[PDB]
Write a protein that binds this ligand. Structure first.
Ligand SMILES: O=C(O)C[C@@H](Cc1ccccc1)C(=O)SCC(=O)c1ccccc1
Ligand SMILES: [Zn+2]
Length: 170
């Protein structure tokens, strides 16, 4: 029913994504499938890389109500400061694993929407954390890449256990 989400340490999460050529109806369908996949997990962000579609497409909904969807296509993210903010990040590609990452606390985001319109907004708080995390997917990076290698290894062993249990539950 929903799109399959790749799991760390799958090497395909390391693929650097290509920009989207045109916002065709097939990329519109992929976005809507991504949203369903993301809302089901549940999560608040998903990059197309995570469903094994190596294109510069991110879906996101930061709302409690699951009713403020956002799309970023071909995004450029630029820090507006060297101040970082800590945040406890998770990731549907590192299921049930959470730890602290310090990222620039304010960023400019420029991207296009599902109608092919360009936009530029500035973000802080949870938006800046999540857009940087999702941009990182697009460049083949996971939030575990910023943890010590014993946190990484333990994350990996734990995730392989979770994935096996999820297969078994099937
Ligand atoms: O790459 C991902 O799969 C998305 C990820 C986004 C994210 C979470 C936390 C920090 C930074 C980025 C997640 O969706 S995890 C979901 C989550 O933590 C959450 C879900 C519902 C309400 C509140 C938080
Ligand atoms: Zn992620």
């Amino acid at each position: 029913a929903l799109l399959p989400i790749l799991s760390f340490p799958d090497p395909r999460l390391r693929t650097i994504a290509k920009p989207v050529e045109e916002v065709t109806d097939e990329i519109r369908q992929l976005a809507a499938d991504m949203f369903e996949t993301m809302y089901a997990a549940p999560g608040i962000g998903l990059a197309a890389s995570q469903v094994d579609r190596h294109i510069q497409l991110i879906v996101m909904d930061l709302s409690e109500s699951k009713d403020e969807p956002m799309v970023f296509i071909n995004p450029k993210v630029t820090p507006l400061t060297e101040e970082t903010q800590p945040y406890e990040e998770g990731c549907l590609s590192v299921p049930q694993i959470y730890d602290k990452v310090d990222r620039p606390s304010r960023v400019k985001i420029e991207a296009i929407n599902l109608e092919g319109q360009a936009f530029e907004i500035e973000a802080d708080g949870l938006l800046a954390v999540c857009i940087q995390h999702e941009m990182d997917h697009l460049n083949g990076k996971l939030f575990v890449d910023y943890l010590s290698p014993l946190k990484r290894q333990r994350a990996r062993e734990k995730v392989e256990k979770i994935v096996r249990q999820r297969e078994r539950e099937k």
